[PDB]
Amino acid sequence: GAYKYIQELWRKKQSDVMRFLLRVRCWQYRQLSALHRAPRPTRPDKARRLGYKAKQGYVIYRIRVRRGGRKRPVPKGATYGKPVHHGVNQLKFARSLQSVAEERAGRHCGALRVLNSYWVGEDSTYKFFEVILIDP
Amino acid sequence: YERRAMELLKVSKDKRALKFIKKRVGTHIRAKRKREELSSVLAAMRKAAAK
Amino acid sequence: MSSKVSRDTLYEAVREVLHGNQRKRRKFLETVELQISLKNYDPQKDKRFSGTVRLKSTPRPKFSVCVLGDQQHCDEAKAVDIPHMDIEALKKLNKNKKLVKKLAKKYDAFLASESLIKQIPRILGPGLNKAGKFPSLLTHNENMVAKVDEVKSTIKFQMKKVLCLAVAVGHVKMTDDELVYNIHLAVNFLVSLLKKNWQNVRALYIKSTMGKPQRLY
Amino acid sequence: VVDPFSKKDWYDVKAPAMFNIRNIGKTLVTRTQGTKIASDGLKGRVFEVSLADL
Amino acid sequence: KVPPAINQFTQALDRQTATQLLKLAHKYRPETKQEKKQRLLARAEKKAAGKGDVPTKRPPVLRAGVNTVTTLVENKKAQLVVIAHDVDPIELVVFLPALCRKMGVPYCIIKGKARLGRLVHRKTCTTVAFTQVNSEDKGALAKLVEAIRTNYNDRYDEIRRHWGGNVLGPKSVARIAKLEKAKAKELATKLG
RNA sequence: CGCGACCUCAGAUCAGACGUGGCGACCCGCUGAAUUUAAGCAUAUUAGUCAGCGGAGGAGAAGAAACUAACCAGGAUUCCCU
RNA sequence: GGUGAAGAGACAUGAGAGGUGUAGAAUAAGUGGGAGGCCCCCGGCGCCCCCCCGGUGUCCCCGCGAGGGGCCCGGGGCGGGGUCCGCCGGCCCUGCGGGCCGCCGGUGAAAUACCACUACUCUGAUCGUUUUUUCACUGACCCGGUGAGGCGGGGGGGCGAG
């Protein structure tokens, strides 16, 4: 079964195809949108495993997200209150970067309903997710 | 990380190879079970080279 | 022949170690012996041998036993056909105040009993003593009802500071069924007492004589 | 360190043909080993050669 | 530098050899549209004549999809495998040549997925494979099979050892050629 | 050059479809403080609460075990007594 | 987050070997013991390479001879070289049909007229891997400028110069 081989391959790492084809997205999300449609699920392994069929009506949008902590947004960073509620450096958001990406793509494309997402690359200050979407 | 541990088993200091695998993968169970797979492959290498 | 090189590694099988030692020409007798390295093997200080073994056949070296006495071995001597003497003069098999002149060891094994444990060089005398090995303590035998034991030469492993002992695993003419049992009954204790830290990367070498002593995994 | 006079050799000197001595003398320098190839720093040197020896 | 398992994808076949391969295939292509329907309808009408239905012999034909090709390769029912070289995610068939090396199945790297697509009604097909062929064409197969396997299977050692790319751009080629010309020209500068 | 495929990627008052916006009693995901309490006060408490944002439905989320257990064993989810 | 090149470094591999002292005649061979190893020149047998043709059963020629015949079986003999691997015999298991003070007599290193288990590393240092030293490389990254306008190689080449 070919998909067994593909699965084992993605499970393994330390081959450069990731480095080759991550720039193919970092450049194009800055040439064209940071949120754009792809014409084929780059990992027909993982798309099908999550639940996908290339029957007409199925879309994937590949989307970039910027990674880091989450600095608490207040003016000049000194938050009024008792001093356990200070602190704006090391705060950590309460949802998976995958989830942030999923919701970004979903809110951008109405009339398309999410089904799941998965990871395709992670440069140094980014994460390159892609989202499977149904045309209901 | 596998190749480095293989070289350290080449020089044959297993009590350092284990520490290297542990400090990178995390659990002594996994390090113990993984040094065995790193051996029995290094062994195959030497055995099929002297062949 | 002036060859000492065992360039082999050598892996064939764990129990097939009987099918590769048979490099025979010697029309004299070939002492197909056995030994092992010295690296991480301290000749005297912290590591040494006490293990036991029993061969089937006496090789070219004289593997026979005789007196001492130290009772039940007076009867063993009179039964195994050697003149027996307690202390009268240390002239049975010595190297300086002797009676006859054969090979410096004059034999390759002499056991003990339980009146005292340093009386071997005082009863029959030196030999291995003069060679720096000690056949007086740690013999692991009393043999009051076993003479076939000594004529099959029940023997041991024991340290030495030069390199080591060297103990025979059979001959080529005799079958390899002999060699397989002999190696796997001798070096099991060697593997126990030398594979604790030294992981056996190199091999245990067979002094397969006539110009090609070798090794086998 | 290594004796600095190690790899300096006596490159030859020559006059115009219109003079009366052509092998004037010699001058030491090291060869190509680093980033200071000899002839590069050799061109631009200038001597003091007089009629009273040439 | 591309890795070995990617650089294997650049020693594709010789054009005329590929042309014999394709002219062979075009007598073997599967049934396309408006042929399927007519053959099946005629077969339905042959049912009343007891001479043909849906279940009846089909002469050997192509096997297109990657899953099917890999299945029959790992069952060793393949006599020839073709591989389009430009596939979108290379991980689709990066492993395949190694599989063919493991099981001694002849395999070749052709240019274009479009040609394999034209070998059916579809637009593209990652691989195709002959399992068996008509005996009269078996020899014509076997000659090309030998030509292929001479170059792609027996030298799996050098193929997997191969590296690629790493070819410096012409601007820098000339830029280094300047200094190499300078050093080659003026060498032996000192009386050494 | 020219032709023809596949791939990428475009515009269109092209053909047919669809989403935003409101209400918010209940539901879901985030953010989320201070009065106040400790007789003072900062850890704690008030509280994952009011305020803020996003998203729906007739109910929503849950749900068929990477579970409880330690027994002579139970056996998805929710709700009430305990 | 990459590349090369050189210098300082560790090491795994890796083809080639081991002379001389404190007791005696050699080196009395890292060591084990053989008072006798043969390095087996060796009758030659176990037996390889010609002839000899039982199945003149195989048949290239073939398509029909006619045989050079190539062949596969299997064969009562070394026609001839023989340590081409290796079991008996004879001899000083050849110091005297090579060859090697006698190990055991030097109280030694385990003694070495001999089989010889090991390796001290220096044997080409290939050949890999790794820590450092700098020098450079550009393809991610960043920087400017423009309506992204002659960039890097070359050549015709014309001008004159020497």
Swiss-Prot record, chain A:
UniProt-annotated location(s): Cytoplasm
Cross-link (Glycyl lysine isopeptide (Lys-Gly) (interchain with G-Cter in SUMO2)): 82
Entry GO terms, CC: cytosolic large ribosomal subunit
GO molecular function: RNA binding; structural constituent of ribosome
Cysteine disulfide partners in this protein: none
A Gene Ontology BP annotation from the UniProt entry: cytoplasmic translation
Main location: cytoplasm
Residues with lipid group (N-myristoyl glycine): 1
Keyword line: Cytoplasm, Isopeptide bond, Lipoprotein, Myristate, Phosphoprotein, Ribonucleoprotein, Ribosomal protein, Ubl conjugation
Residue(s) carrying Phosphoserine: 33, 96, 99
Signal sequence segment: none
Function noted in UniProt: Component of the large ribosomal subunit. The ribosome is a large ribonucleoprotein complex responsible for the synthesis of proteins in the cell.
Family named by the database record: Belongs to the eukaryotic ribosomal protein eL15 family.
Assembly and interaction partners: Component of the large ribosomal subunit. Interacts with IFIT1 (via TPR repeats 1-4).
Name recorded for this polypeptide: Large ribosomal subunit protein eL15
Full-protein positions shown: 2 to 137 of 204
From Swiss-Prot, chain C:
Phosphotyrosine PTM sites in chain numbering: 11
Statement: the UniProt record of this protein carries the keyword Cytoplasm: yes
Cross-link (Glycyl lysine isopeptide (Lys-Gly) (interchain with G-Cter in SUMO1)): 118
Keywords per UniProt: Acetylation, Cytoplasm, Isopeptide bond, Phosphoprotein, Ribonucleoprotein, Ribosomal protein, Ubl conjugation
Classification via SUPFAM superfamilies: Ribosomal protein L1 (SSF56808)
GO MF annotation: an example: structural constituent of ribosome
Oligomer and partners: Component of the large ribosomal subunit.
Annotated family: Belongs to the universal ribosomal protein uL1 family.
Superkingdom field: Eukaryota
Protein's UniProt name: Large ribosomal subunit protein uL1
UniProt-listed GO biological process terms: translation
Function: Component of the large ribosomal subunit. The ribosome is a large ribonucleoprotein complex responsible for the synthesis of proteins in the cell.
Major location (coarse): cytoplasm
Disulphide bond pairs: none
Positions of post-translational N6-acetyllysine modification: 91, 106, 118
Family matches, as CDD domains: Ribosomal_L1
Record cross-link Glycyl lysine isopeptide (Lys-Gly) (interchain with G-Cter in SUMO2), residues: 118, 161
GO CC annotation: cytoplasm; large ribosomal subunit
Keyword S-adenosyl-L-methionine applies: no
InterPro entries linked: eL8/uL1-like, Ribosomal_uL1, Ribosomal_uL1-like, Ribosomal_uL1/biogenesis, Ribosomal_uL1_3-a/b-sand, Ribosomal_uL1_CS
Swiss-Prot record, chain D:
Superkingdom assignment: Eukaryota
GO biological process, one term: translation
Cross-link Glycyl lysine isopeptide (Lys-Gly) (interchain with G-Cter in SUMO2) residue location(s): 14
Keywords: Acetylation, ADP-ribosylation, Cytoplasm, Differentiation, Isopeptide bond, Nucleus, Phosphoprotein, Ribonucleoprotein, Ribosomal protein, Ubl conjugation
Gene Ontology CC terms, in alphabetical order: cytosolic small ribosomal subunit; nucleolus
Keyword Acetylation recorded: yes
The keyword Ribonucleoprotein belongs to this UniProt entry's keyword annotation: yes
UniProt modified residues of type N6-acetyllysine: 14, 36
Molecular-function annotations in GO: structural constituent of ribosome
Cell compartment(s), UniProt: Cytoplasm; Nucleus; Nucleus, Nucleolus
Subunit structure: Component of the small ribosomal subunit. Mature ribosomes consist of a small (40S) and a large (60S) subunit. The 40S subunit contains about 33 different proteins and 1 molecule of RNA (18S). The 60S subunit contains about 49 different proteins and 3 molecules of RNA (28S, 5.8S and 5S). Identified in a IGF2BP1-dependent mRNP granule complex containing untranslated mRNAs. Binds with high affinity to IPO4. Interacts with DDIT3. Part of the small subunit (SSU) processome, composed of more than 70 proteins and the RNA chaperone small nucleolar RNA (snoRNA) U3.
Family: Belongs to the eukaryotic ribosomal protein eS1 family.
Protein name: Small ribosomal subunit protein eS1
Organism whose genome encodes this protein: Oryctolagus cuniculus
Classification of source organism: Eukaryota, Metazoa, Chordata, Craniata, Vertebrata
Covered range of the whole protein: 21 to 74 of 264
Swiss-Prot record, chain E:
UniProt keywords, alphabetically: Acetylation, Chromosomal rearrangement, Cytoplasm, Isopeptide bond, Ribonucleoprotein, Ribosomal protein, Ubl conjugation
Molecular functions (GO terms): cadherin binding; RNA binding; structural constituent of ribosome
Cross-link position per record: Glycyl lysine isopeptide (Lys-Gly) (interchain with G-Cter in SUMO2): 23, 51, 171
Endpoints of the signal sequence: none
Record-annotated disulphide pairs: none
Primary localisation category: cytoplasm
GO biological process: cytoplasmic translation; maturation of LSU-rRNA; translation
Compartments, record wording: Cytoplasm
Record: disease: Chromosomal recombination involving RPL7A activates the receptor kinase domain of the TRK oncogene.
Subunit structure as annotated in this protein's UniProt entry: Component of the large ribosomal subunit. Interacts with CRY1. Interacts with DICER1, AGO2, TARBP2, MOV10 and EIF6; they form a large RNA-induced silencing complex (RISC).
Protein name: Large ribosomal subunit protein eL8
Organism: Homo sapiens
Residues represented out of the complete protein: 75 to 266 of 266
